[PDB]
Each structure stands twice: as structure tokens, then as C-alpha cells.
């Protein structure tokens, strides 16, 4: 099927590393050379993981082994097997899944590109997505490497993956003082503010007061030019945004790549270089 006006954009080709073969759609999705692969991993994961759900802790029999998202979780191998394929049962499986998921985001990521091409548009989207992609590597790869352990990454638990942070986080006591985590946090906030403004304003100009005209920038560019005094501008908002977020991510990315392989003391301490300044 197609959108009211989609029927007129589905050109031929535009693919990246080949794909002029499966260069077609299905439902509302373009396949290509990446919609294809990503799929593979998807089931050889979304389901490969099912095996895990099946297996569980001890075994598929252990009263420990359950089928409640809230609990189900695939655990990485022991730090034992450092940078080596662990026994699926003991770790590998986890690795396997993770193996896939990597590509599934590398495909869909690229697939995005082929699209970005077809629809002869800008590529800000994927490029952005990549960061988000990366932050997933430098948080289950770039780090665990400089820790010589694959099993040294994190789990795949609906909420189980929560603790994994709880710990590695306290491993430095007041993780909160991590310089990055502070900023990286700040962003994931600022973003959730500007956003709660743009997406608001707009939905307040195009659908303004009763019996009123679809307001124009000649308002917007003043809306805040009144409350706060200044207005970043309209084009801008759609900049500051990506900015914030595409940074917040990359930040946090740092945030946990350095926590450990680049710093072992409790963060609170790091903050000492400050104090000790030959001045105060």
C-alpha cells in the first residue's frame, strides 16, 4: 500500500552497497540491501533470545527460570572468558544476541541512508541515529574491551539491566559527581525542555485561540521575545534540538567509557583536582 501521495516518490534504485535487487517495498517499508539483513538478526535474536527466555538461569527447569518480562533476562558471560566466545549457556548466547543487535542497528541505520537517498532528502536523521547507535557500542564494546571482558558488558533484562547499572554505578560510590554524567544528564534535560516548548508552541500557533488565524512567525519570534526576552529563532529550534540530544548521547557515551578503564577511584574524588588548586 501507499500514502495519499507516496505513490509518486517510489523511484527505482538509489541503493548504497548494492540493493538494486531487493530494491522494493513491503507494506510501508522499503527493503533494499539492509532492510533484508536487519530482519535476519531480528528473528535470530527476538527469537534466539526466546531460547534464552526458555533456558533461564540454572536450566529451563530451575524454578529460577521464568517467563515474565519483568524478570526474564539474558546474562553475559563471566569475566572469566575475557575477550572470547563463551558457552551460549554460560555467556556466548548473550554474545550471540548482542552479535546480531549490532548489525540490526547497523543495517536499519544504513537502510535509513538508502531511503534518505530515494526521497532525495537530507541525511541528518541517520547521522543522528548513529550516535545513538555508537553509545550502544561504547557501552558494551569500547568499554568491555578496555576491560578485557565481553561478559564485562551489560545484560538484556526488561528491568534486569537496571541493576547492572545500579552496581557499576556505585562502583564509584556517588556516580552522580561524574563530570560527564552531570552534563550528559543536563542535556537529556534541556532537550526535554526545549522540546516541551517547540512541539508546544507550534501546536499553539497552528491551532490558536478560538476564531483566530493560523498565526505566523511574526508571533512565534516574539512569543519568547516577551516572556524570556529573546527567541533562538524558528529554524534554530530544529537545530538546538538535534544538538542537545545528539550531544547528550555522545556525552553519556563518554560518561561510561571513561568510568572504569579511565578512572578507578570514586568520581566524587575526581572532583578533587579542583580543591587542590594552588589558590584557595
Amino acid at each position: 500500500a501507499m500514502l495519499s501521495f507516496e505513490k509518486k516518490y517510489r523511484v527505482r534504485g538509489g541503493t548504497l552497497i548494492g540493493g538494486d535487487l531487493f530494491d522494493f517495498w513491503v507494506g510501508p517499508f522499503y527493503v533494499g540491501f539492509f532492510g533484508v539483513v536487519g530482519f535476519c538478526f531480528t528473528l535470530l535474536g527476538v527469537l534466539l533470545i526466546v531460547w534464552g527466555a526458555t533456558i533461564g538461569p540454572t536450566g529451563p527447569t530451575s524454578d529460577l527460570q521464568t517467563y515474565n518480562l519483568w524478570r526474564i533476562s539474558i546474562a553475559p558471560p563471566d569475566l572469566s572468558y575475557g575477550l572470547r566466545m563463551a558457552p551460549l549457556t554460560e555467556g556466548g548466547l548473550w554474545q550471540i544476541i548482542t552479535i546480531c543487535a549490532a548489525g540490526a542497528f547497523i543495517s536499519w541505520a544504513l537502510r535509513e541512508v538508502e531511503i534518505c537517498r530515494k526521497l532525495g532528502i537530507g541525511f541528518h536523521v541517520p547521522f543522528a541515529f548513529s550516535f545513538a547507535i555508537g553509545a550502544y557500542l561504547v557501552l558494551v564494546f569500547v568499554r568491555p574491551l578496555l576491560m578485557g571482558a565481553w561478559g564485562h558488558g551489560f545484560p538484556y533484562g526488561i528491568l534486569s539491566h537496571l541493576d547492572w547499572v545500579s552496581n557499576v554505578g556505585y562502583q564509584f560510590l556517588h556516580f552522580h559527581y561524574n563530570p560527564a554524567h552531570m552534563l550528559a544528564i543536563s542535556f537529556f534535560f534541556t532537550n526535554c525542555l526545549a522540546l516541551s516548548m517547540h512541539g508546544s508552541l507550534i501546536l499553539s500557533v497552528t491551532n490558536p485561540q478560538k476564531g483566530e488565524p493560523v498565526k505566523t512567525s511574526e508571533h512565534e519570534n516574539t512569543f519568547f521575545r516577551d516572556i524570556v526576552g529573546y527567541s533562538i529563532g524558528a529554524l534554530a529550534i530544529h537545530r538546538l534540538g538535534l544538538f542537545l540530544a545528539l550531544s547528550a548521547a555522545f556525552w553519556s557515551a563518554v560518561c561510561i567509557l571513561i568510568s572504569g578503564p579511565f578512572w578507578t577511584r570514586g568520581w566524587p574524588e575526581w572532583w578533587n583536582w579542583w580543591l587542590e588548586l594552588p589558590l584557595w
Partner: protein, 319 residues
């Protein structure tokens, strides 16, 4: 190799546009608007002018007061010795009243200034929401900021008036300093189970994510199709075009379904509001409700279960 709308390459300028004039009641705007090439190499280089009504001043005033308290008391700490004030800055602060005067007006010393200053960052904050809805519709504008602002301002009160005062504790209310405040969240997680187990937080997260997600997409998307006036959404909302044509289409042949140059801006305003919403939720439950969310969780069949390579002993029992 196409000019990816990063920083407005070449700029241009025209006189100070003091916005659309306002009705009978909206006092004169004020300020002699300025320009900054730099600031402007990102957005509307013009600066100001800004409005200032009653709540406008009334609120701003109630603002630079708490600051002049939470600011003062703080400096006092490091015995008016700025040098260290500068040093122990990120550490300093102003704590609330001691568990005794749970709700009673704390003495001029013991956590007093904080309750004082607090209420003045309780009104001015609430008063500034007025400096919105007011200056908002007096622009012929509907209300969606004013709305959200609440959702957020809601959570703020879930960290005070509504809960701290709800448990009789001029302590259960966050401190007043970057680090110490940075500690309150820490302290909290503990005192009561471990937040990672109170859904309404593990929830309010996904949102603080989505926003960190979406307004991060649509920010790009727009840009991607900003050549095709995507940035001009305004009209695209009304008279569509190739912008919302190329855009949404993307997501159509990507994640399948998709929406409109309008809709998106909706989810936007939503995820956002649906954030501080879920925030103040848990924070409200956590306290006068469940006391340990970890127990809650598992007691509901939530909290997971792993093997056991390590366990300890219990003095209170064997001893």
C-alpha cells in the same frame, strides 16, 4: 557535500521588530534590542526586547530573592570567605529544617532560610507560569506551554508542598545546592527501596528518553528536509508541500507507520509532559505509599531473580 544547515552561513539584518502590538492592558514592551553575530550564527541574532507586566515583575522579584537567600546563607557557610566559596562552590548549599520542626516554621537559623527562600522559589516559579498563560493568549495564542509548564511545575511541587509537607518533614524536601541536591536524589533512592523499582520512575525515564529521542529526530528530519522549507512547518501544517511529503514518507518506508508535520509536534508536547507527570508520580507514591520499591516489585512478582555466588550472614539473628 551539501550545505548541511549547521550555522547560518551568511546572515543579514533589519530593524528591531518589537513584535505584534498588544491590546488594552499589556504595558509597553521594553528594551533596545541588540544583535550578536555569534549568537546569530545559530539563531535569530536579534536580542529582545522583552515584556514585563505585573506578574512579570512580581514574579521576577519573587525570583531574585530566594537566590539572594539560598545565595546568601550559602556564602555565609564558608564564613563569608569567597575564595573558598569559589572552591567549595559545587559542594556548598542550604539545607532544610531539622526533623523536629517537621512542618513548623524553622528558626531563623536551623533550616529556616531554606523554608523562607523555598517559598520564594515556590511562588515566583508558580507566578512565572502566569507570566506565560498571560503573555501567551494575549498574543491570540492558545495554551500548551502554560499547560506543560504545569506538568513540570507539578513535579516540582511533588518535591515539596505536596509530599515533603505531606510526610511532615521539613527535611523530606530536597536541599539547595548542585552537589547536595545531587545527593538528595541519591539519598532518596536509598531511604526508600531503590527507585529503579518504582515503576513511575522506570517509566518517567522512558519519556525523558523519548524526548531525548524524538525532539532529537524531528529536529533532524526537519533539517533533512529544511531545504524544502521543512523548518517552515507553520505553513506546512496548513498548506502541506514537498517538505512533509519527503519527511513523513521517510519514516513510512522506515518504521512503517508515520504521521504529519502536525502530529509529531503533538507527541513532542506529550512525551515531554508525560515525563514530569510520571516523575512527580513515583516521587509522590514513594514516601507516603510504598516504602521500599524493591520489596514492592518482587512482592508483585516483578523484581527478577538470579543465582547466588555470594551471600552473607546476619548479626541481628545469630548474635
Amino acid at each position: 557535500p551539501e550545505y548541511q544547515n549547521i550555522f547560518t552561513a551568511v546572515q543579514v539584518r533589519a530593524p528591531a521588530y518589537p513584535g505584534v502590538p498588544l491590546p488594552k492592558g499589556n504595558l509597553p514592551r521594553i528594551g533596545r534590542p541588540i544583535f550578536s553575530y555569534w549568537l546569530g550564527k545559530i539563531g535569530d541574532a536579534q536580542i529582545g526586547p522583552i515584556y514585563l507586566g505585573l506578574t512579570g515583575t512580581l514574579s521576577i522579584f519573587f525570583g531574585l530573592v530566594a537566590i539572594s537567600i539560598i545565595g546568601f546563607n550559602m556564602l555565609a557557610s564558608v564564613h563569608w570567605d569567597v575564595f573558598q566559596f569559589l572552591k567549595h562552590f559545587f559542594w556548598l548549599g542550604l539545607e532544610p529544617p531539622p526533623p523536629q520542626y517537621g512542618l513548623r516554621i524553622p528558626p531563623l537559623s536551623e533550616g529556616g532560610w531554606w523554608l523562607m527562600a523555598g517559598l520564594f522559589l515556590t511562588l515566583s516559579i508558580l507566578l512565572w507560569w502566569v507570566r506565560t498563560y498571560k503573555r501567551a493568549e494575549a498574543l491570540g495564542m492558545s495554551q500548551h506551554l502554560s499547560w506543560a509548564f504545569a506538568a513540570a511545575i507539578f513535579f516540582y511541587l511533588v518535591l515539596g508542598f505536596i509530599r515533603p509537607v505531606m510526610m511532615g518533614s521539613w527535611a523530606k524536601a530536597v536541599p539547595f545546592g548542585i552537589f547536595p541536591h545531587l545527593d538528595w536524589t541519591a539519598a532518596f533512592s536509598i531511604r526508600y527501596g531503590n527507585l529503579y523499582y518504582n515503576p513511575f520512575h522506570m517509566l518517567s525515564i522512558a519519556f525523558l528518553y523519548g524526548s531525548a529521542l524524538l525532539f532529537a529526530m524531528h529536529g533532524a528530519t526537519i533539517l533533512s528536509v529544511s531545504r524544502f522549507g521543512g523548518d517552515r512547518e507553520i505553513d506546512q501544517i496548513t498548506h502541506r508541500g514537498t517538505a512533509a511529503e519527503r519527511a513523513a514518507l521517510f519514516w513510512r518506508w522506515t518504521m512503517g507507520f508515520n504521521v504529519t508535520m502536525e502530529s509529531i509536534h503533538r507527541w513532542a508536547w506529550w512525551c515531554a509532559v508525560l515525563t514530569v507527570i510520571t516523575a512527580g508520580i513515583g516521587i509522590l507514591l514513594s514516601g507516603t505509599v510504598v516504602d521500599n520499591w524493591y520489596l514492592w516489585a518482587v512482592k508483585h512478582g516483578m523484581a527478577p531473580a538470579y543465582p547466588e555466588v555470594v551471600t552473607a550472614v546476619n548479626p541481628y539473628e545469630t548474635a
